[PDB]
Amino acid sequence: GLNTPHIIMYLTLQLDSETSKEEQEILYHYPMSEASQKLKSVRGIFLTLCDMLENVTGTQVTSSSLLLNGKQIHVAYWKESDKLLLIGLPAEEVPLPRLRNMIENVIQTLKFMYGSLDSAFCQIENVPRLDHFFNLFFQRALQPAKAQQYDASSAVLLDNLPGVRWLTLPLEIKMELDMALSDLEAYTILGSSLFYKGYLICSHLPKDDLIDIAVYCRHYCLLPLAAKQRIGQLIIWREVFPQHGRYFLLVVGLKHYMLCVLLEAVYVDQVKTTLHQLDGVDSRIDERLASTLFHYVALETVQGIFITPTLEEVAQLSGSIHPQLIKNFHQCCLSIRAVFQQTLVEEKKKVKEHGVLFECVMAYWVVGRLFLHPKPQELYVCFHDSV
Amino acid sequence: GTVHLLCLAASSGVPLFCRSSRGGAPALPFSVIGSLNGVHMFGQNLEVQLSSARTENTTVVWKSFHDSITLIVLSSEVGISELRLERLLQMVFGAMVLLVGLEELTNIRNVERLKKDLRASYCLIDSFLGDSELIGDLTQCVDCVIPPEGSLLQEALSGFAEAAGTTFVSLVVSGRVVAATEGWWRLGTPEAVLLPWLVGSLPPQTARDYPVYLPHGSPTVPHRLLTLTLLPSLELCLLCGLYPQLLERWWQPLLDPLRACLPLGPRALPSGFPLHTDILGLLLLHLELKRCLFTVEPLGDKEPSPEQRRRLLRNFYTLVTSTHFPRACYLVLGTEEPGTGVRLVALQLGLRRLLLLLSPQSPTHGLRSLATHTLHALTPLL
């Protein structure tokens, strides 16, 4: 990752100043290192290509593929208003559909943070914050590291999905959680979403807002997984703009709970009291988490959640080549998502039972199924050829 | 479905031609082509290639060949893939080499004469751009048709080759080769696809003598190619480094088998071949033998348009080249309403990759077993 080139850049499109210095063009540029000086120099072709293809083609540039020094580099564009935002990473680690999903998430998160991304980048005070966020994001994209690898192995697709890791809730615990959340609601609370061990254990938030908050947490290290060390006292109280006056994101992480609230224009004390009485629910959920479809990535896009076997399950399901089986699943799911993504573009403008088979000795037969007429959903399955 | 191809003088920075196939084969500002030339050159100086700059509606691919020629494509095709464009540029450069050669293409730059030499290439280029009936332009494999179980055809081809004193003699139909000399088979893959394609693209004449420069055989030695039209849509290719009568010496007693394989051009399958009723498309690929058997019409009931079936198979191949390169695939597609669409299957086994289009009612459970049975049936054929 350190050696591979990677750039985030914010040149000013349609610049009309004869001072062609890099500062005049570039408004923000996080790396500013050896791995990015090349792209900083070659920004001219990016600008010229973007404007020319905007001219000839009714649509703007979404992706340019440059074979730089013998290695492939995908750069994703974004033209909004006299401004252009470019993200370039090597292909051999992040494929192009993953890069497009990643730029979509990045733009969404920036708009979430500082509203108009133009004001996000023009300001100088927030530059250290943007640099830290982009450092973490680039590290996530290029360095999967830093049972500890299953989450990293699957994050190729889990970050791609427009959903959130959801846990099959027992009904009694479900109503207990709903009662607790209602008590918490009883500024202005616009909903909430409680997570356990990184699993979305309850969600009263609207789907778009919940997705925005979850991806904001994912871009950081807030959301844990694999039952990490109990979150001590991390409380975040920030301003946000979830495409809807002044809005605040609150989030308290105590023990394994990762509770979040959205507020509209002292609440930490009441939410702490609310989660304090939730001292028995974790016990009731521990053994539930503990307790031939070898792997399913069943999704619910309308709800914004998806269900996959827990890490304890895959540890129980660990077999001869299962550690390789899961990663093979998760890299093929990217291609399945790519074709389904083309189909989704076709659907939102106004294919369905894709599958492959592997033998790198058991017939994995990973298959992606799409549902559109009912509540739209995706189902990625494994099964031996016998079944 | 609009494609705008461009060839440019790389070092000179002057347009060479702008063959386009927008809305079909019948079909640009100087400033815009200068702009793409400028961005390509800026990439070249900065030692960074420009493989693709795909937009939402279009997709482009540059190719700097021998640092002397520059190739651009503007493909607004729905579901266009990078591999299809890369193959198209590679093979169109192969065509340009065939029509002119290494010289006058690299090194020496003809400012205005090269226009005159390239004037002849336009027919082959726009045949390439249009939705032809062959796949050699995509799969890089020569399009073949199984002969009607006759070795006498190969024996007579060898006899004709001996009589004409040439090791490159091949009987080609509708652009698909049905018989060839061993030298023709061993001949390099880009020109192997090109030569039958050029013959098919050429208008039918009694006999044609044309100069060709083999991209791998002889880019500098101007080989001569003779097309002998025994009957329309079938030709004899005689490729040598001048007035043979041997066509009636050898092919006259071979008239009956030749008439038997005459309709096999579009058929690309032996008459009465046992195949599963669900099969609506065969695209057998033998990469070891560098051949492809492409049957598009085993049934004209569902998806009656053969053009639609060919486009579907080509898109499936462009999607499976990324996956494949025991392993199999299936990409059931179409409208979300049940009983519509198609089922596309892929199998790879011993360099014998095969694509199967199936009926919309074809069951999805036994798709792999169906593919294995089809591959076993077609194994002796190719």
Numbering used by the authors:
A (entry chain B): 302 to 447, 456 to 495, 512 to 569, 587 to 607, 623 to 648, 798 to 856, 876 to 885, 899 to 925
B (entry chain A): 8 to 34, 38 to 251, 259 to 342, 362 to 418
What do the authors say?
The tri-longin domain (TLD) RabGEF complexes represent a family of RabGEFs with a unique conserved structural core. In each complex, two subunits that contain three longin domains (LD1 to LD3) each form a heterodimer, which is required for catalytic activity toward the cognate Rab GTPases. We here report the cryo-EM structures of the Mon1-Ccz1 and Inturned-Fuzzy core complexes bound to their cognate GTPases Ypt7 and Rab23 in the nucleotide exchange transition states, revealing a conserved catalytic mechanism with distinct modes of substrate recognition. Thus, TLD RabGEFs rely on both conservation and variability in the switch 1 regions of their substrates to realize catalytic efficiency and specificity.
